């Protein structure tokens, strides 16, 4: 019945030089609140912290960020002038008092881009189990590929007969770069779903790979020929086949 800690937005693409406030609110009457960024080599680095309403302090990496703590509920993180090194995953956390268990929010993917029309949605395709796999193992692996996306703000899920599956699934933990020589390279991500040969063979079974992309908001301006690369779902699907 408490909402707990919630961060807003869940995703943001920012043009360089723009101001941005990440919000974090909690309805748990917690006194201590924290902002961290997480980056692949570096783990979680404390940006700023606030042990109590009206007191804030600098963490390990405070430069380029500020916070305030006017109220117990809220701890806003402000980027005065966003630069590409601020591309990160940001986590707000809170604890009842300084020293107790920290509870983390869901995280905010923030990508700061110098050029907005580097931003692209994924294309999605499902590849059907090979007949040689079915014959050799009595199992049937489907592969989903999400390709051509930038930045890497995607969540891939599998849906079998309208219900999300987790069993027999694995998805790459990191997307790969399609052109690693380019520092603005588009990305690709794959996932597998493996079922028994008889499940795949039933033409009543429906398999869908769904990719949630987080892009430009409805606010942002767009002037290119192609569609505005908004936050959107791209899917692909296959039906079971006896033959």
């Amino acid at each position: 019945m408490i909402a707990g800690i919630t961060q807003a937005p869940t995703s943001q693409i920012l043009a360089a030089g723009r101001r941005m406030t990440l919000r974090c609110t909690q309805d748990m009457r917690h006194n201590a609140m924290y902002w961290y960024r997480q980056d692949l080599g570096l783990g979680l680095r404390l940006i700023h912290y606030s042990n109590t309403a009206g007191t804030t302090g600098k963490g390990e990496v405070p430069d380029g960020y500020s916070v305030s703590r006017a109220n117990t509920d809220d701890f806003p993180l402000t980027l005065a002038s966003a630069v590409p090194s601020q591309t990160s995953v940001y986590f707000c956390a809170s604890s009842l008092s300084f020293g107790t268990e920290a509870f983390f929010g869901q995280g905010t993917r923030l990508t700061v881009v110098e050029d907005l029309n580097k931003v692209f949605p994924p294309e999605v395709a499902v590849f059907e189990p090979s007949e040689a796999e079915i014959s050799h193992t009595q199992k049937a692996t489907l592969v989903c590929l999400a390709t051509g996306f930038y930045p890497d703000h995607v969540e891939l899920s599998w849906w079998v007969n309208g219900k999300e599956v987790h069993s027999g699934v694995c998805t790459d933990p990191q997307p790969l770069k399609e052109q690693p020589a380019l520092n603005d390279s588009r990305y690709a991500l794959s996932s597998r779903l493996r079922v028994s040969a008889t499940f795949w063979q039933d033409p009543r079974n429906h398999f869908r790979c769904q990719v949630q992309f987080y892009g430009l908001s409805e606010n942002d301006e767009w002037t290119q020929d192609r569609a505005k690369p908004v936050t959107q779902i791209v899917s692909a699907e296959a039906w079971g086949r006896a033959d």
Binding site: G43, L44, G57, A102, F127, P129, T141, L145, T171, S190
Partner: protein, 202 residues
């Protein structure tokens, strides 16, 4: 992480074995010690806390603190592939700071029952010229190398668990839009073991 330190790993542990994670910290002002577990694309969640010297046990987890030697450790008995996560050491310091280490990625490798290494070619369910290569059913000691060609894409391996069959398997995927590509150009002798079953697609 500078007052709190951890090896980044990845640490690789065979399933069933003890996984051991260690963390060191600055002694000035350190009060309380935490182990967080963070799954891929998720938030850190508290698994254990400790504040006095000695062992603390909870199920398969054992935390150990030695403040004199300035380390804290986590043991995971009977390790399962679903323990694969990043483990984050956190330390409470006087004045308000909750400082995290860099995290150690633990990979708990399944014992592949019947290795049957194979590379299969799969066609797009939609009308196109597209296919992907699936290397699968290889043992957990197989290393999948990154592509050496810009236009050939090769993923890292992952473990899937078909829970109702009690069956785990490893796989990696490759693909390319190069005109003369064969799956063997990606899953070549630098990656695949001897006697990989590599059937021609029909």
């Amino acid at each position: 992480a500078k007052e709190v330190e951890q090896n980044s790993g990845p640490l690789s542990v065979p399933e069933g074995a003890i996984a051991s994670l260690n963390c060191t910290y600055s002694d000035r002002g350190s009060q309380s010690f935490f182990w967080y577990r963070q799954y891929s694309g998720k938030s850190p969640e508290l698994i254990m806390f400790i504040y006095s010297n000695g062992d603390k046990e909870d199920g398969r987890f054992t935390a150990q603190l030695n403040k004199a030697s300035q380390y804290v450790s986590l043991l995971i008995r009977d390790s399962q592939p679903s323990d694969s996560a990043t483990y984050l050491c956190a330390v409470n310091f006087g004045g308000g700071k909750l400082i995290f280490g860099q995290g150690t990625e633990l990979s708990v490798k399944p014992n592949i029952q019947n290795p049957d290494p194979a590379v299969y070619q799969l066609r797009d369910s939609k009308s196109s010229d597209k296919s992907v290569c699936l290397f699968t059913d290889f043992d957990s000691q197989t290393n999948v190398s990154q592509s050496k060609d810009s236009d050939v894409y090769i993923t890292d391996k992952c473990v899937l668990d078909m829970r109702s069959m009690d069956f785990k398997s490893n796989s990696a995927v490759a693909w390319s839009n190069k005109s003369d590509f064969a799956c063997a150009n990606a899953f070549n002798n630098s990656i695949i073991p001897e006697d990989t079953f590599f059937p021609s697609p029909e």
